[PDB]
UniProtKB/Swiss-Prot annotation:
Gene3D superfamilies the UniProt entry points to: YdfO-like
Family: To E.coli YbcV and YcgX.
Name used for this protein in its record: Uncharacterized protein YdfO
One family name in Pfam for this protein: DUF1398
Ranges in coiled-coil conformation: none
Superkingdom to which the source organism belongs: Bacteria
InterPro entries for this protein: DUF1398, YdfO-like_sf
Gene: ydfO
Length: 127
């Protein structure tokens, strides 16, 4: 199942932190955008024009807080920039920033961070 392949990449990268193979397979599979829900650890990978891959992990739900702040986002990415810390912690602070919709649109080279009310919190170039 193609869902298994995608999920396994994320399962590893959360703690492994290798970005080359991660981003390589990203552009080599996800030619459009994936919608990552930090609320359920569920990911809507909408491919080029192929199909939508739905991942399901960390079955607990509600790991996000409705506290939409843009600075908490940039501070967390700055931390990732320097030490890279851990991908799981990176998303923990993002969930605390009210990021419900992790929409990485590779097709446009943007990573959009939306709150539940679909307001644009922040965005960055995926590199």
């Amino acid at each position: 199942d193609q869902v298994v392949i995608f999920k396994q990449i994320f399962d590893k990268v959360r703690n492994d932190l290798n970005y080359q193979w991660f981003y390589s397979e990203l552009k080599r599979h996800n030619v459009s955008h994936y919608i990552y829900y930090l609320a359920t650890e569920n990911v809507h990978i909408v491919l080029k024009n192929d199909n939508t891959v739905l991942l399901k992990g960390l079955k607990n739900i509600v790991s996000v807080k409705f506290s939409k702040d843009r600075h908490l986002i940039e501070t967390t990415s700055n931390k990732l920039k320097s030490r890279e810390i851990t991908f799981q912690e990176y998303r923990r602070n993002l969930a605390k920033a009210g990021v419900f919709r992790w929409v990485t649109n590779i097709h446009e080279q943007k990573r959009y961070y939306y709150t539940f009310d679909n307001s644009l919190l922040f965005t960055e170039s995926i590199q």
